[PDB]
Amino acid sequence: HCPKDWTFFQGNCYFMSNSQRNWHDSVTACQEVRAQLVVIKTAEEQNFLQLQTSRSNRFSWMGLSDLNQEGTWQWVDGSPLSPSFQRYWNSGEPNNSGNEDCAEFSGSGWNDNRCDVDNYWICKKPAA
């Protein structure tokens, strides 16, 4: 069971924003609704999110970043990016932007983009 306007998928609820904001404000926006900028835990979830993103032609932020530009990607839950997910980057990605780097769903895979760019976002929280 999920709140109205939230999507249920494999035990979790996902909120697809209908507006755009920078990565930081997106992290904040999800906490406002007792959720978290989506942290992908399984390949099934990734396929699901990538699909929703591509069908709506909307570049969307996920809770993954390398704010120090040290090439060290971490999820907002504190966990690191497993090498198993490195395959989700689009061709040539991730290419540092020269500024704080954040991950976005773009077409078929993920892109590295500047964190202050305005993108749609996706929040996630357990179903009830």
Ligand X SMILES: CC(=O)N[C@H]1[C@H](O[C@@H]2[C@@H](OC[C@H]3O[C@H](O)[C@@H](O)[C@@H](O[C@H]4O[C@H](CO)[C@@H](O)[C@H](O)[C@@H]4O[C@@H]4O[C@H](CO)[C@@H](O)[C@H](O)[C@H]4NC(C)=O)[C@@H]3O)O[C@H](CO)[C@@H](O)[C@@H]2O)O[C@H](CO)[C@@H](O)[C@@H]1O
| 50 counts as binding ligand X under rule CB under 6 A | no
Q: Is residue 57 at the binding interface for ligand X, with CB under 6 A as the rule? A: yes
Q: Is 47 in the site for a second copy (CB under 8 A)?
A: no
Q: Residue 70, interface with a second copy (CB under 8 A)? A: no
Among 47, 56, 68, 79, interactor with a second copy by CB under 8 A? 68
- In SS3 terms, the chain reads as CCCCCEEEECCEEEEECCCCECHHHHHHHHHHCCCEECCCCCHHHHHHHHHHHHHCCCCEEEEEEECCCCCCCEECCCCECCHHHHHHECCCCCCCCCCCEEEEEECCEEEEEECCCCEEEEEEEECC
Query: Distance of alpha carbon 19 from its chain centroid, rounded?
Result: 15
Residue 45 contact partner, candidates a second copy, Ca ion, ligand X, none, CB within 5 to 8 A by sort of partner = none
Site string for ligand X, 96-115 (x = CB under 6 A): -x--x-----xx---xxx--
Nearer to a second copy among residue 7 and residue 17 (C-beta): 17
Distances (CA, A) of 1 to 7, 18, 40, 45, 126: 9, 21, 20, 17, 9
Shortest distance (Å) from residue 27 CB to a second copy: 6
Q: Out of 50, 63, 73, 88, which residue is the one contacting a second copy (CB under 8 A)?
A: 63
**Chain residues in the site for ligand X (CB under 6 A):** 53-54, 57-58, 90, 92-93, 95, 97, 100, 106-107, 111-113
